[PDB]
Design an enzyme around this catalytic site. Structure first.
Site, PDB file in Angstrom:
ATOM      1  N   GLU A  72     130.655  32.467 -75.086  1.00 44.16           N
ATOM      2  CA  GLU A  72     131.602  31.462 -75.592  1.00 44.16           C
ATOM      3  C   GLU A  72     132.615  31.018 -74.539  1.00 44.16           C
ATOM      4  O   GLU A  72     133.009  29.843 -74.493  1.00 44.16           O
ATOM      5  CB  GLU A  72     132.384  31.990 -76.787  1.00 44.16           C
ATOM      6  CG  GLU A  72     131.623  32.331 -78.042  1.00 44.16           C
ATOM      7  CD  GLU A  72     132.561  32.934 -79.116  1.00 44.16           C
ATOM      8  OE1 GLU A  72     133.202  32.163 -79.869  1.00 44.16           O
ATOM      9  OE2 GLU A  72     132.673  34.179 -79.178  1.00 44.16           O
ATOM     10  N   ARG A  74     129.032  39.975 -87.478  1.00 42.40           N
ATOM     11  CA  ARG A  74     129.258  40.369 -88.871  1.00 42.40           C
ATOM     12  C   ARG A  74     129.000  41.847 -89.159  1.00 42.40           C
ATOM     13  O   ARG A  74     129.276  42.326 -90.268  1.00 42.40           O
ATOM     14  CB  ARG A  74     128.393  39.515 -89.800  1.00 42.40           C
ATOM     15  CG  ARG A  74     129.101  38.282 -90.355  1.00 42.40           C
ATOM     16  CD  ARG A  74     128.207  37.521 -91.300  1.00 42.40           C
ATOM     17  NE  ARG A  74     127.263  36.665 -90.596  1.00 42.40           N
ATOM     18  CZ  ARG A  74     126.236  36.084 -91.183  1.00 42.40           C
ATOM     19  NH1 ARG A  74     126.035  36.287 -92.482  1.00 42.40           N
ATOM     20  NH2 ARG A  74     125.422  35.299 -90.477  1.00 42.40           N
ATOM     21  N   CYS A  95     128.397  33.274 -88.040  1.00 46.31           N
ATOM     22  CA  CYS A  95     129.057  34.326 -87.226  1.00 46.31           C
ATOM     23  C   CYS A  95     128.066  35.413 -86.814  1.00 46.31           C
ATOM     24  O   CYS A  95     127.403  35.996 -87.667  1.00 46.31           O
ATOM     25  CB  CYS A  95     130.262  34.973 -87.972  1.00 46.31           C
ATOM     26  SG  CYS A  95     131.166  36.389 -87.090  1.00 46.31           S
ATOM     27  N   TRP A 109     137.283  39.407 -81.527  1.00 49.12           N
ATOM     28  CA  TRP A 109     137.262  39.383 -80.073  1.00 49.12           C
ATOM     29  C   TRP A 109     136.106  38.506 -79.584  1.00 49.12           C
ATOM     30  O   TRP A 109     135.176  38.225 -80.343  1.00 49.12           O
ATOM     31  CB  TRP A 109     137.126  40.784 -79.523  1.00 49.12           C
ATOM     32  CG  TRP A 109     135.994  41.537 -80.112  1.00 49.12           C
ATOM     33  CD1 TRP A 109     134.666  41.441 -79.773  1.00 49.12           C
ATOM     34  CD2 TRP A 109     136.077  42.533 -81.133  1.00 49.12           C
ATOM     35  NE1 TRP A 109     133.923  42.322 -80.523  1.00 49.12           N
ATOM     36  CE2 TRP A 109     134.767  43.004 -81.369  1.00 49.12           C
ATOM     37  CE3 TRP A 109     137.136  43.081 -81.869  1.00 49.12           C
ATOM     38  CZ2 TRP A 109     134.490  43.990 -82.317  1.00 49.12           C
ATOM     39  CZ3 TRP A 109     136.858  44.055 -82.809  1.00 49.12           C
ATOM     40  CH2 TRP A 109     135.545  44.497 -83.029  1.00 49.12           C
TER      41      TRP A 109
HETATM   42  C1  HEM Z   1     135.124  40.732 -84.205  1.00 49.06           C
HETATM   43  C2  HEM Z   1     134.075  40.188 -83.573  1.00 49.06           C
HETATM   44  C3  HEM Z   1     133.563  38.733 -83.760  1.00 49.06           C
HETATM   45  C4  HEM Z   1     132.617  38.187 -82.996  1.00 49.06           C
HETATM   46  C5  HEM Z   1     131.916  38.913 -81.827  1.00 49.06           C
HETATM   47  C6  HEM Z   1     132.391  36.824 -83.437  1.00 49.06           C
HETATM   48  C7  HEM Z   1     131.483  35.921 -82.907  1.00 49.06           C
HETATM   49  C8  HEM Z   1     131.230  34.640 -83.367  1.00 49.06           C
HETATM   50  C9  HEM Z   1     130.462  33.614 -82.693  1.00 49.06           C
HETATM   51  C10 HEM Z   1     129.775  33.758 -81.323  1.00 49.06           C
HETATM   52  C11 HEM Z   1     130.441  32.521 -83.457  1.00 49.06           C
HETATM   53  C12 HEM Z   1     129.735  31.204 -83.080  1.00 49.06           C
HETATM   54  C13 HEM Z   1     130.834  30.188 -82.810  1.00 49.06           C
HETATM   55  C14 HEM Z   1     130.347  28.856 -82.304  1.00 49.06           C
HETATM   56  O1  HEM Z   1     129.185  28.757 -81.815  1.00 49.06           O
HETATM   57  O2  HEM Z   1     131.152  27.887 -82.384  1.00 49.06           O
HETATM   58  C15 HEM Z   1     131.212  32.798 -84.660  1.00 49.06           C
HETATM   59  C16 HEM Z   1     131.467  31.948 -85.724  1.00 49.06           C
HETATM   60  C17 HEM Z   1     132.195  32.236 -86.872  1.00 49.06           C
HETATM   61  N1  HEM Z   1     132.807  33.453 -87.198  1.00 49.06           N
HETATM   62 FE1  HEM Z   1     132.796  35.150 -86.103  1.00 49.06          FE
HETATM   63  N2  HEM Z   1     133.240  36.587 -84.502  1.00 49.06           N
HETATM   64  C18 HEM Z   1     133.977  37.736 -84.730  1.00 49.06           C
HETATM   65  C19 HEM Z   1     134.937  37.891 -85.709  1.00 49.06           C
HETATM   66  C20 HEM Z   1     135.102  37.119 -86.834  1.00 49.06           C
HETATM   67  C21 HEM Z   1     136.149  37.252 -87.837  1.00 49.06           C
HETATM   68  C22 HEM Z   1     137.287  38.318 -87.763  1.00 49.06           C
HETATM   69  C23 HEM Z   1     135.933  36.281 -88.758  1.00 49.06           C
HETATM   70  C24 HEM Z   1     136.712  35.956 -90.055  1.00 49.06           C
HETATM   71  C25 HEM Z   1     137.503  36.837 -90.670  1.00 49.06           C
HETATM   72  C26 HEM Z   1     134.746  35.543 -88.368  1.00 49.06           C
HETATM   73  C27 HEM Z   1     134.157  34.473 -89.020  1.00 49.06           C
HETATM   74  C28 HEM Z   1     133.462  33.425 -88.429  1.00 49.06           C
HETATM   75  C29 HEM Z   1     133.293  32.100 -88.989  1.00 49.06           C
HETATM   76  C30 HEM Z   1     133.837  31.575 -90.334  1.00 49.06           C
HETATM   77  C31 HEM Z   1     132.450  31.318 -87.965  1.00 49.06           C
HETATM   78  C32 HEM Z   1     131.997  29.849 -88.073  1.00 49.06           C
HETATM   79  C33 HEM Z   1     133.145  29.006 -87.536  1.00 49.06           C
HETATM   80  C34 HEM Z   1     132.663  27.643 -87.126  1.00 49.06           C
HETATM   81  O3  HEM Z   1     131.454  27.490 -86.802  1.00 49.06           O
HETATM   82  O4  HEM Z   1     133.499  26.698 -87.128  1.00 49.06           O
HETATM   83  N3  HEM Z   1     134.277  36.082 -87.197  1.00 49.06           N
HETATM   84  N4  HEM Z   1     131.667  34.102 -84.562  1.00 49.06           N
HETATM   85  C1  LIG Z   2     132.643  24.220 -80.277  1.00 49.15           C
HETATM   86  N1  LIG Z   2     131.951  24.800 -81.444  1.00 49.15           N
HETATM   87  C2  LIG Z   2     132.303  24.065 -82.679  1.00 49.15           C
HETATM   88  C3  LIG Z   2     133.484  24.714 -83.377  1.00 49.15           C
HETATM   89  C4  LIG Z   2     134.563  23.954 -83.846  1.00 49.15           C
HETATM   90  C5  LIG Z   2     135.654  24.558 -84.466  1.00 49.15           C
HETATM   91  C6  LIG Z   2     136.603  23.821 -84.929  1.00 49.15           C
HETATM   92  N2  LIG Z   2     137.494  23.182 -85.306  1.00 49.15           N
HETATM   93  C7  LIG Z   2     135.652  25.935 -84.667  1.00 49.15           C
HETATM   94  C8  LIG Z   2     134.582  26.696 -84.209  1.00 49.15           C
HETATM   95  O1  LIG Z   2     134.648  28.050 -84.424  1.00 49.15           O
HETATM   96  C9  LIG Z   2     133.865  28.964 -83.676  1.00 49.15           C
HETATM   97  C10 LIG Z   2     134.444  30.357 -83.788  1.00 49.15           C
HETATM   98  C11 LIG Z   2     135.333  30.685 -84.802  1.00 49.15           C
HETATM   99  C12 LIG Z   2     135.867  31.973 -84.887  1.00 49.15           C
HETATM  100  C13 LIG Z   2     135.510  32.953 -83.957  1.00 49.15           C
HETATM  101  C14 LIG Z   2     136.029  34.256 -84.019  1.00 49.15           C
HETATM  102  C15 LIG Z   2     137.005  34.683 -85.085  1.00 49.15           C
HETATM  103  C16 LIG Z   2     135.630  35.183 -83.068  1.00 49.15           C
HETATM  104  C17 LIG Z   2     134.732  34.803 -82.075  1.00 49.15           C
HETATM  105  N3  LIG Z   2     134.329  35.696 -81.138  1.00 49.15           N
HETATM  106  N4  LIG Z   2     134.246  33.543 -82.033  1.00 49.15           N
HETATM  107  C18 LIG Z   2     134.614  32.616 -82.945  1.00 49.15           C
HETATM  108  C19 LIG Z   2     134.091  31.331 -82.860  1.00 49.15           C
HETATM  109  C20 LIG Z   2     133.495  26.094 -83.569  1.00 49.15           C
END
Ligand code: HEM
Ligand SMILES: CNCc1cc(C#N)cc(OCc2ccc3c(C)cc(N)nc3c2)c1
Ligand code: HEM
Ligand SMILES: CNCc1cc(C#N)cc(OCc2ccc3c(C)cc(N)nc3c2)c1
Ligand SMILES: CNCc1cc(C#N)cc(OCc2ccc3c(C)cc(N)nc3c2)c1
Ligand SMILES: CNCc1cc(C#N)cc(OCc2ccc3c(C)cc(N)nc3c2)c1
Ligand SMILES: [Cl-]
Ligand SMILES: [Cl-]
Ligand SMILES: [Gd]
Ligand SMILES: [Gd]
Ligand SMILES: [Zn+2]
Ligand SMILES: [Zn+2]
Ligand SMILES: [Zn+2]
Lengths: 401, 402
Positions: free
Chosen positions: A282, A108, A105, A277
């Site tokens: 994305e 953070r 993420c 948000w």
């Molecule tokens: C509030 C602003 C937030 C921003 C700007 C943000 C942004 C991102 C981005 C860009 C990714 C990469 C996703 C991808 O490439 O698939 C990500 C992944 C992730 N974020 Fe955040 N997020 C936010 C909030 C949160 C919150 C509220 C949580 C949990 C309480 C969180 C936990 C995670 C987790 C666990 C991943 C990995 C999920 C995965 O790869 O399947 N984030 N986030």
């Molecule tokens: C296509 N990439 C593989 C992929 C697969 C799955 C599944 N199943 C979930 C994935 O979670 C990305 C993610 C998760 C949470 C997010 C939150 C809270 C905020 C934010 N701005 N971006 C976020 C992006 C990514």
């Protein structure tokens, strides 16, 4: 202890936190797999203990009166029913830590400001759905989005779990065709395949908001319709290219990932939707430009009058960038919270600086922290990172069907 | 144990069996991944040699009868009287290509078959060295129609000093330190520019002053050498619609020719073996022209584009970088000098992975370095899972001889 260097600055840190990585990753000294997407009473007890000591240490109750009391309360509870219950505050701490420890993420630096909804008293499908609605509404906040998590009952011995069969709370539908193509978001065919066959009358739009498939224990999953005033969307327009609005594109406000399992001190929560948000790229780069997502890149290239016959015109790059400009503009114009990849990565660098003083380091996954476009332009590109797994944490789990 | 790897666009799954022969160790453990880090004797000389011979004889299918067990026992014996041994010229060519084939960070390995290996092992002095180098540049440049090449100078051996090239590349621009704290030219090369001058070079004052060569013979000091200006093919940078670009005064050289890495073959080490290919536009466009501590023309170009550089969300950085890359691509094609864009480069690398999977049951690849530095997910390698590891023969990093 790992020596990590910022090559744009020449400054050095040592990641001392990596030394406490609770688990093991997929890498070995023989071969690195850091680009892979998806890598019992004493067990539950030792995890419970490590967590409860981490809580009291965080609040500086290291060796306190109240410290030794809770330890043996868990010892007792687990001794009596194997599993045990989290105090409200222990649960809020867990939620923030898990977010904080998520190596992929980039947002953070916001980890301390998270709203935790306790829905552990939930009992049915209908009650889940209400709890979700209050979430979506608290978190949307008329465009001024707010981070929040809603936790449902923890897992129990010999019983079906609460699950959310939707990967996110808001997902557009995906419809197959006579000619094998797909109408809508093709990532969501597998779940439209279900909702339709679970009692949902389907649309045909490219942007049909999916119904929620919600499952209570044992008494099988049950469909639910979202109130369309709860689901805020942004129509997409471009600031100088007047024809872009006519493409008829939109995206939703609220990234709300549900299908992940939250783990806290040995307790596993199959259902716990969290939301933040969006970062612009994305929506712009992954959701609209990925070849097996909406895949609009070329269409936009044609309208910009670019030479699509030759990669050297860099039409893909030119289109992609204006699609990202359209996203930001559209969100700003609608007053819905959004962050660009430059502002995002810049705040993340500040976070590394924070975590360095606070905890001796920070689990970061370079291949996911670096944005999908303009990678080398952002300041995380030339920053060396260490990836590892801490607890509490968000994990993946098998598709509930 | 097989590493299951998936292509997420296609849905295809392969198993990297090749990783099992992972010669060296990386910096990663199950505790933590360090995959983003830039920098991580008769008995075992013989074990390295043996393995190398068994690759080379398996290469031409005919493996396990003729001059194979002959060559092994011949090598095993050659180490006995001396320690170090010597390669058959065909063994040198083979190992040379292998070391390119194996390099995990090079997206251009589709071409590894067609490499021109120049044998300079009989080279004797700093002057003959220079002569081999000018020939290398001459063949590889080829009036703009670039060809892959490598020249191998004599192996490191006890009782002798090393042949060494002090320059990081055959063609590099100078970098002067101004009084005002700024650097005229390429800031990456302040160090080598310091040295060249201290060793007699009369410097320039330009942003694109081509550097001399400092060449080192065994147990002898490095000698200074000017490349003849007509040997270095350079390209003026201009934009195909933005006519004010040309007044930025930019140019880059045609030939990327890395001279400061160690070539390791079958336990033997060639500290001086410069190899060259042709550029991918992003290296020149994004890395050399836009990096903050390289030439750093991004804001400058942005302003001339009348972009809004006051705020990140205008994406002025992205917009200016894309046009800079367009200028590079267009200038090189105008000049009839070989170049390749990151979409083309990556699509060919995907074919390479298909070849390598059929051939060797895998392919060492470092995701963070294969994925271009702009438009990552627009190319096919972004969503391709990869396995990184070390195989021999190899190009390796080595200390600055100072
Ligand atoms: C509030 C602003 C937030 C921003 C700007 C943000 C942004 C991102 C981005 C860009 C990714 C990469 C996703 C991808 O490439 O698939 C990500 C992944 C992730 N974020 Fe955040 N997020 C936010 C909030 C949160 C919150 C509220 C949580 C949990 C309480 C969180 C936990 C995670 C987790 C666990 C991943 C990995 C999920 C995965 O790869 O399947 N984030 N986030
Ligand atoms: C296509 N990439 C593989 C992929 C697969 C799955 C599944 N199943 C979930 C994935 O979670 C990305 C993610 C998760 C949470 C997010 C939150 C809270 C905020 C934010 N701005 N971006 C976020 C992006 C990514
Ligand atoms: C023919 C066209 C070629 C292209 C387009 C190409 C492209 C590239 C690129 C873009 C990189 C990454 C550089 C960076 O991001 O800083 C790289 C790395 C590398 N390439 Fe090349 N290359 C070519 C030819 C060759 C040849 C002929 C050799 C050797 C005989 C070679 C050996 C290497 C090695 C050893 C690395 C890793 C060096 C390091 O990590 O320090 N390449 N290549
Ligand atoms: C949406 N689920 C199906 C899906 C469709 C498409 C398409 N078209 C692409 C997908 O790629 C997921 C993926 C794979 C590798 C990744 C790597 C190495 C790094 C990174 N930052 N993100 C990655 C995301 C997934
Ligand atoms: C900033 N990068 C760190 C860096 C350090 C070192 C060291 N020591 C060497 C590096 O070589 C990258 C390279 C090597 C050969 C190339 C060839 C033949 C062709 C081509 N187009 N590009 C190439 C790029 C890069
Ligand atoms: C001091 N040497 C000159 C120099 C200048 C600048 C600047 N400005 C940046 C430098 O770091 C190159 C670097 C660092 C990390 C990388 C990672 C993780 C991945 C990747 N694909 N490429 C990378 C390239 C080196
Ligand atoms: Cl999404
Ligand atoms: Cl270069
Ligand atoms: Gd038109
Ligand atoms: Gd013009
Ligand atoms: Zn690793
Ligand atoms: Zn993607
Ligand atoms: Zn760079």
């Amino acid at each position: 202890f790992p020596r990590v260097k910022n090559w744009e600055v020449g400054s050095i840190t040592y990641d001392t936190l990596s030394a406490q990585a609770q688990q093991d990753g997929p890498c070995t000294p023989r071969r690195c797999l850091g680009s892979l997407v998806f890598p019992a009473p004493e067990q539950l007890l030792s995890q419970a203990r490590d967590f409860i000591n981490q809580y009291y240490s965080s609040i500086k109750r290291s060796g306190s009166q109240a410290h030794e009391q809770r330890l043996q309360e868990v010892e007792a509870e687990v001794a009596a029913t194997g599993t045990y219950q989290l105090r409200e505050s222990e649960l809020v701490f867990g939620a923030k830590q898990a977010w904080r420890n998520a190596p992929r993420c980039v947002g953070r630096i916001q980890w301390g400001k998270l709203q935790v909804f306790d829905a552990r008293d939930c009992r049915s499908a209908q009650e889940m759905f209400t709890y979700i609605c209050n979430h979506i509404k608290y978190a949307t906040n008329r465009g001024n989005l707010r981070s929040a998590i809603t936790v449902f009952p923890q897992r129990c011995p010999g019983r079906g779990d609460f699950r959310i069969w939707n990967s996110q709370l808001v997902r557009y539908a995906g419809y197959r065709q006579q000619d094998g193509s797909v109408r809508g978001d093709p990532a969501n065919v597998e779940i439209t395949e279900l909702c339709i066959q679970h009692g949902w009358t389907p649309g045909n739009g490219r942007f049909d908001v999916l119904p929620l498939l919600l499952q209570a224990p044992d008494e099988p999953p049950e469909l639910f319709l979202l109130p369309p005033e709860l689901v805020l969307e942004v129509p997409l327009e471009h600031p100088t290219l007047e024809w872009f609005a006519a493409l008829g594109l939109r995206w939703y406000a609220l990234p709300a990932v549900s299908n992940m399992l939250l783990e806290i001190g040995g307790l596993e929560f199959p259902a716990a939707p969290f939301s933040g948000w969006y970062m612009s790229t994305e929506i712009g780069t992954r959701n609209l430009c990925d070849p097996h997502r909406y895949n609009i890149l070329e269409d936009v290239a044609v309208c910009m009058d670019l030479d699509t016959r030759t990669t050297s015109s860099l039409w893909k790059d030119k289109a992609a960038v204006e699609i990202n400009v359209a996203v930001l503009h559209s969100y700003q114009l609608a007053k819905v919270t959004i962050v660009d990849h430059h502002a995002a990565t810049a705040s993340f660098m500040k976070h590394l600086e924070n975590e360095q003083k606070a905890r001796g380091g920070c689990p970061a996954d370079w291949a996911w922290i670096v944005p999908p476009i303009s990678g080398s332009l952002t300041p995380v590109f030339h920053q060396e990172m260490v990836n590892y797994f801490l607890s509490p944490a968000f994990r993946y789990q098998p598709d509930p069907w």
